[PDB]
Design a protein around this ligand. Sequence first.
Ligand code: ZN
Ligand code: ZN
Lengths: 348, 349
Amino acid sequence: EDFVVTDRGGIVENSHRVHAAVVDAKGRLLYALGNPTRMTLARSAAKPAQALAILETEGVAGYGFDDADIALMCAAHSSEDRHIARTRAMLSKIKAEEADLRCGGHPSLSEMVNRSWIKQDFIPTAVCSNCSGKHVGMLAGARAIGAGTDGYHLPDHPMQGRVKRTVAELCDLDAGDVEWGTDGCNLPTPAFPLDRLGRIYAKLASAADGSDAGEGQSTRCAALAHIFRAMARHPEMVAGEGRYCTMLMRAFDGALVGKLGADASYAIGVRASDATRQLGTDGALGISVKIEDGNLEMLYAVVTELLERLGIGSPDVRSQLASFHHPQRVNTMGVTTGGVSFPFKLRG
Amino acid sequence: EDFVVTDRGGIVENSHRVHAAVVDAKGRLLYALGNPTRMTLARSAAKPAQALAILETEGVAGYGFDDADIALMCAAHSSEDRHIARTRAMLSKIKAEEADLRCGGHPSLSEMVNRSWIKQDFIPTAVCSNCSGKHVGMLAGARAIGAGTDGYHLPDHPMQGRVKRTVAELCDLDAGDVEWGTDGCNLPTPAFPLDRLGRIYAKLASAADGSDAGEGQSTRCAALAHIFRAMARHPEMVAGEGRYCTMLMRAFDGALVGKLGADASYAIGVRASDATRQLGTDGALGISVKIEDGNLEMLYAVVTELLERLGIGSPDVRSQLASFHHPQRVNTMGVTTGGVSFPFKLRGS
Ligand SMILES: [Zn+2]
Ligand SMILES: [Zn+2]
């Protein structure tokens, strides 16, 4: 019975089923909407796990990827010129070429960018892929271990072996409880219970907390903390101008990281704060969300509403997101015709 | 309940709740999915009832609207140049101007038309509205009874009083059982049980059957028959090139009319046929569908699946709709990554 709803003049137009998990740094379930263990394709929200697989590949350190490169590895970017430029710069660092990519072009995730492409009849290529940074990192990993760069995207390649292991490990799942399909960018892509997506991001944030504190860290926790700080420092690489993820991460100014998955999943890693303590946990927090029918506009409204209900942020921080929280319903003559409502109830 | 489901490598991606009603010519429920009486905003799918109100307005006959004009009154067109052109020619027939329209421009319902507008930096205006034909019809009726064109779109104008009474009468509902919001084109827009949307379209097809067969008809049934005929004859006016509605109606070549409502409603009126007799009725049939979350891609897939389940059309006729039936699920490198499935059973009365 957990829904987000749009109305016209009080009459229900559409309704969308919501699933959400709120977990602690061990993955213990604190709050939920809908079915918080729903088997769910993480899509682009898996990218911090895939970036960890890259950064844990021996020899990748020698290429000198910077924080903005790492953020782009974690990106579903808008294919802005700066994303394309950074993709080529990362290819140059590993002495590869666009022709070595195994992802393909697609209409930009930004409406404003895609409008400019349409105006020019532009044909996007591999380098414009929203996943281009993850693909450059996977090439780098393939080149670093000496495996061969053709086939780096294939499930029998050792780089995909590393990804599959790393995802199960962060999720704390046996390999048999993670399912695999193929993504738009033509990499294997994982599916696992929705709460475990929150667990991954809770572990990002927890690692960021330990790094910031000066605590001793395993090589994996060090790398997670690096991923968090890269995303939070360069949120415009993770998505782009006007994008929810970018506006979300700039508003919060290092307190959390957040990421979209295609077909309306979302994941947030919250560093330990007054808010998380108020929720009843002594460490970092993870949040995962899926809109059952895949509608992105409703995803962003639900994620902002959930941050409000969880007390994360302040009204002024969250207010930067106001156009997503309450999407505009204006007709062709400027008349408001209805709006969005949140008939769901968090359960503990 | 009843879902259309999309997968990626067999892993469930999205699922969409389906509502559908199959009704006979008197509105008796024959088959259903979901909640067949769901209160639903009919949106553009109510436009034949709005057309009926226009055509029943005293004196509208004197403008000489033709079959393609009536089709455009029933349309959610793609704002192709011919749709705009017919809108202006209809303004001319009633001696009105673009400045009289109270609908506004919007991005074209056709991705291909919208590509050309972006390239040309084109800003759509009132004459480009997908509802433009409806709005010229309502100007016409307003002027035909001397009620004035100013405010023709407002609930207190007698043309809108005529629309509201007419919607309830076609649905066979009391006035309080129809709810009203405001549409994207800035007209009043009705909400009523989904099966009643099927009833409107069954009444369309039924009247066309009666008209073809030479039966005595009231002015209203004669007018429903003209509406069906105008839509079936000019499916390109009702939508446009490449649009589901147009391709559907062309494939069936007069046997049915079909129309989209925004946020994924759909309605079909089916003329009496071997298919409909096999479904247990002696007359015409009406179908209405709503995808709960509003997804258009899923709507067209479900409607086409539902035609196959009902045996409506030859399997050869329906293969013209294959690309809508099972939408493409291929990635940026040409690899098929998933599909759509229909794990529901149509429940019969
Ligand atoms: Zn990808
Ligand atoms: Zn309209």
